[PDB]
């Protein structure tokens, strides 16, 4: 969800039913304008909110002009003051393999491995996993230059109605056609394609990481995505599929 079109995106009307209050909405317009000011980002997308147990973890990401770098994501508790999260790696994301469940409130909560595991590093590494596995990009929004710098397509139309239902018309928003298609998915059928308001909306609801919502209309220019959910991976998915 883009910062300049947060009110111009059907969040509560997307069908997931996990949106924002007017308090959180006005806080996101003012605070995402603030993190567009002091952090020199080309464009800032509201990533989503993690529900937590005692407090909500509002997550937003910012991007440079290269458009394929790892995201300098940001977090907030009262949805007003935002600060940068440390960059993530594989060895640091390995560390929470012995713990599971929801995570609550302040980043200073220590988890038992006994190595004390911080809440903040678990949060940003989980953000990296949800970015890597799910939160797809639409087709035609990312065109390729001969150099390594990728630009967002200003001439993006970019999905016909015959290609809305197909899996192959969505790529993973991850540096790796351009990117890995959604038919390279395990298990087969881990995305719920659903028709709301006729042809005026489609949702690609992720089932490996619920409740991630991918935001159309066709003929547009949004081209957005939002994850609001419990925060942990759905390892239960092939049983229910």
């Amino acid at each position: 969800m883009d910062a300049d079109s947060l009110l111009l995106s059907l969040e509560l009307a997307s069908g997931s039913g996990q949106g924002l209050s007017p308090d959180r909405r006005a806080s996101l317009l003012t605070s995402l304008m603030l993190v567009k000011r002091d952090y020199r980002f080309a464009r800032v997308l509201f990533w989503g909110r993690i529900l937590g147990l005692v407090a909500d973890y509002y997550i937003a990401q910012g991007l440079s002009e290269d458009q394929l770098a790892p995201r300098k994501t940001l977090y907030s508790l009262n949805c007003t003051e935002w600060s940068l999260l440390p960059p993530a790696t594989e060895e640091m994301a390995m560390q929470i393999s012995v713990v599971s469940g929801r995570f609550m409130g302040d980043p200073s909560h220590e988890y038992e491995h006994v190595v004390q595991i911080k809440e903040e590093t678990r949060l940003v590494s989980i953000i990296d996993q949800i970015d890597k596995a799910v939160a797809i990009i639409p087709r035609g929004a990312l065109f390729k230059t001969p150099f390594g710098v990728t630009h967002v397509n200003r001439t993006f139309e970019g999905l016909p109605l015959s290609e809305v239902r197909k899996l192959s018309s969505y790529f993973h928003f991850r540096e790796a056609d351009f990117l890995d298609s959604l038919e390279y998915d395990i298990p087969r059928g881990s995305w719920s394609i659903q028709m709301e308001r006729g042809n005026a909306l489609v949702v690609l609801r992720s089932l490996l990481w619920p409740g991630l919502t991918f935001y159309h209309a066709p003929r547009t220019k949004n081209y957005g995505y939002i994850y609001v959910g419990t925060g942990e991976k759905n390892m239960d998915l092939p049983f229910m599929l």
Binding site: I186, P187, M235
Partner: peptide
């Protein structure tokens, strides 16, 4: 291991 008829393993 859990072999499924949907074309995947766990």
């Amino acid at each position: 291991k859990y072999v499924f008829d949907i074309g995947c393993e766990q």
